[PDB]
Write an enzyme that holds these catalytic residues in place. Sequence first.
Site, short mmCIF file in Angstrom:
data_model
loop_
_atom_site.label_atom_id
_atom_site.label_comp_id
_atom_site.label_asym_id
_atom_site.label_seq_id
_atom_site.Cartn_x
_atom_site.Cartn_y
_atom_site.Cartn_z
N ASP A 39 0.83 -1.20 0.00
CA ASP A 39 0.00 0.00 0.00
C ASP A 39 0.87 1.26 0.00
O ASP A 39 1.97 1.25 -0.58
CB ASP A 39 -0.95 -0.06 1.21
N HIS A 69 -3.78 6.05 3.76
CA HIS A 69 -4.54 4.89 3.32
C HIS A 69 -3.93 3.58 3.83
O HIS A 69 -4.64 2.73 4.39
CB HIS A 69 -4.63 4.94 1.79
N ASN A 161 -14.04 -0.17 -6.45
CA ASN A 161 -15.06 0.79 -6.00
C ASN A 161 -15.83 1.41 -7.16
O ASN A 161 -16.24 2.58 -7.09
CB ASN A 161 -14.43 1.89 -5.15
N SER A 224 -11.17 -1.09 -0.13
CA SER A 224 -9.89 -1.04 0.55
C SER A 224 -10.01 -1.32 2.04
O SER A 224 -9.03 -1.75 2.66
CB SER A 224 -9.24 0.33 0.43
#
Length: 279
Positions: A39, A69, A161, A224
């Site tokens: 990530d 994130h 998404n 996520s």
Amino acid sequence: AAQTNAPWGLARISSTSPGTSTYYYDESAGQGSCVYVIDTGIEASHPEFEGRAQMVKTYYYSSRDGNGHGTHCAGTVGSRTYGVAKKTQLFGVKVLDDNGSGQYSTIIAGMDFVASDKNNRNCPKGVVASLSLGGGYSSSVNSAAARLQSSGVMVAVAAGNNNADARNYSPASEPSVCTVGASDRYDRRSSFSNYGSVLDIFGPGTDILSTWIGGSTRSISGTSMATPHVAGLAAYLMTLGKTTAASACRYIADTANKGDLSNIPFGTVNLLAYNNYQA
């Protein structure tokens, strides 16, 4: 063990019903397992990680999470308050820059890095990788995820998404990894969650409280956020000896809460990750 006033997603994964707020789990808590969070990095100094997080690789000028994130996702895997597997070891691999972007070539290198790097770590109960990232279909990206899984790592990836079929996104569309959709606190498919035959499981993804950079916390939404619930659950179940890296996605589907989500399109699994813990 019981954590009162837990984030709704943690309570959800240990419950046969929505609408409760205590998370119940075996005290082994993923001890002896390892989860790689591939990530934007992890703010390992966050008190919520208790020294159990560390950066092991970056492809950029810093291994610090300048975005948040990756720290949020890592918190859902394994932070003391916000995490599923509260005693796992967390390893950060920074394939995404501080804007949250990354080239597929870097992402692929990061996956092959984890497949090798696990041999430099102590993970007697097993190894998981959480990939809260993706873009358009790429056979090379899917192949890298397949290799990581084949090497003995439980790979959990975000479905995406786009409120669309995940068949057109990578690594979501790789059949051999665990592709995770998102649900909300009322057991509805999250409004943005991708769907389709390639999904293996749903996890909590709307309004998920977790760690953030600057030693903070915040609530955000996405596939996520669902992915690290599943990654942490796998690490927890592997520590319990109930499953293995090669079989954990299927075991999670076997033992999931079935038929309880709304707005699941015909042909997509109606399965919600569940730890089946009996206090």
